[model samples]
Target: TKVSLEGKRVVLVPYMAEHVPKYHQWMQDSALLEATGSEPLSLEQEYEMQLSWTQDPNKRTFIVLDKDFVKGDLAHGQPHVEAMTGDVNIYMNDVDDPKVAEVEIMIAEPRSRGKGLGKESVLIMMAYGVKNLEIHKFTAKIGESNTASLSLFRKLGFEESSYSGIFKEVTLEYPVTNLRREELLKLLDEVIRHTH
Candidate 1:
């Protein structure tokens, strides 16, 4: 399924074969590599990853975009290549048990940092997960030292679930139910107002 999620500052679009080349370029940066804990991949392998993510029913990946281009009609073909900001994904282990899933986000562009785009991206994705996917628990596994990323999830009301001393990792979770459904969708509509 191809879906495009648009936010106030960022837009989430389907990760297509055309977007893979620029993604390969972004992966070349050591800062992004360390932050995302990604291995170096040749163009071939990168395309392979895109293919797997696209075909796998357990994976929902969105390439984040700057809303400017999306609104201006420049986002026709591969405009996402130039306006690409980052990506967010939901990965589930068992399709049969879709209630719980791990989520990840990366704002790869330096200029796109500290703008709350990542938060909005995560929120809308969470809304989609809660409603369409019927997910009850969304977990984020973040590095302990990544304070900014830690607070990003914390401020969104994800409670600390557990800690791993060996890996210095923190796992936070957001439990969404009918009680919080209206509240989340309200904010979801506010940030990501349209699709293009």
Candidate 2:
């Protein structure tokens, strides 16, 4: 139930106890809350939620560790909570539809964006979903105003599916295939080759 996927720009480590404090700090920002559709929770509640996610079969999550930060900090100490740049998650659509899932990524710190880490983290997660979860279709419901997010998913092969003007949200879907699965993993390996 625990996994760590490493790559050039970032590493994906299972969301754990040490991640919650920094994660809780990120959610305290109102702008991030609106964009991520997350509510501010007391530190106590955050720990409880982390425990819940760890036990929940319907959800999988990982803390996005910035590789650069880890390299610079490891000599000082094993990467601490502050080394976390963001989080990526997959939520099954429903128990009755196990192959359909929803995915989301949040680069919690603005400083960590535009460096290709988000892209790599997302690619790794999609590969994991296919290899581990048997997910056939993955979707993301993004705020209409979040064109950057929409574009990221678009570039990853997700197609815009529907728009709800009333809610000002757009849904994007990617129908998974063996070809795409191989493609994502191929790119991941490409990055690792470049990194080491």
Candidate 3:
């Protein structure tokens, strides 16, 4: 199934080949590299990786764009284009139990930083995963030195599940009996409003 979600400040549109160039540029940002524990890739390499992601059935990747740029208005409809800040992904690790998936987000544009886009993107992704995909648990493995992400994930109800010298693993679980979807949406909406 195709995955696309629109929020107050950003839209998560399905990943496309045309988005690879920005992904290549984002790879050049040292801070982004450090946060993601990744090395820079050439344009060809980035395109190939994007193709793999596009074809992967177990992975859902979205190129995050500025909503107004794509939609002409922030409050209505789906975006069919890109302003391409970065991307968010949810990949299922276990075929036997698809309820558990690993999540990732990158806001690669420096200009877009500090605008609560990352928070909104994550919230929308999680909500879609839980409600539409029947995913009950989401996990993120963040670099030990990436304090900004660590704090953000914690604030969104992800608890630290484990820690090593190099990485911190966090998980957010929604129990069948006590789902907090509404609460999360409200918190994210308030954050977007205040940050704007």
Candidate 4:
């Protein structure tokens, strides 16, 4: 399913082949490239990569856009930046159950940092897991040193279950939910109280 979340001035769309140019430019930023561990890609490479992902029935990537947010001089809430891109892949965890789905990879361009976009993207993926996959649980392996990513997952209600020393992998889990408003409110209240 192609999903886009329009914010005050930004429009987030599912990543596609047509967005390769923007992504290529985005990958040129030194910091962004380093974080993603790659250099700028040619248009052909980007197109092929996007096509493969789209053709696969199980993978997805979302792209962020700022339409009305950008004008000649004044930039509204629109990020004076490139579009955000993130891939969502499903993989089997080490657990015995083949029914569970685990997040294989998630990458956000460095220029798009510090914008709460990561969390939002995660929620979108989580919604897909719940609504379409009928998945009761989701897990992810995060490097223990990747404090930001680890914290974000924890904030989203995932709890650390275990860790691996050699790989520096920390596994986290999310349980199934009915999406009951009251239940969520109560959970948030407890969370707030605990943190406070």
Better of 1 and 3 by TM-score: 1
* Local accuracy of candidate 1 as per-residue lDDT tens digits, 107-129: 88788888888988898888877
The C-alpha local distance difference test score for the whole of candidate 2 amounts to: 0.80
Residue pairs of candidate 2 with colliding backbone atoms: none
lDDT of 4 by residue, 59-141 (tens): 54445444333333322232323444444455444366644677643455555456666665566555555545656778877
Off by over 4 Å in 4: 2-11, 25-44, 66-99, 104-111, 179-196
The C-alpha RMSD in Å for every predicted model, in order, reads 2.6, 3.6, 5.2, 8.4
lDDT of 4 at 176: 61
Candidate 4, position 56, lDDT: 62
lDDT of 3 at 126: 75
Measured by TM-score, how close is model 1 to the native structure? Answer: 0.87
lDDT of 2 by residue, 12-79 (tens): 77777878888898998888888886888899999999999878888888788887777443322233
User: lDDT of candidate 4?
Assistant: 0.56
Question: How high is each candidate's TM-score?
Answer: 0.87, 0.88, 0.79, 0.64
lDDT of each: 0.80, 0.80, 0.71, 0.56
For candidate 4, the 10 contiguous residues with the lowest summed lDDT are 187-196
Clashing pairs in 1: none
Clashes of 3: 0
Cα lDDT of model 3 by residue, 1-196, tens digit: 3545667788777677767666787788788887885777888878888788878988887888876556454343333445778888888896778788788888887778888989888887776676667777788888766788888888877777777654453344433224475655454454322110
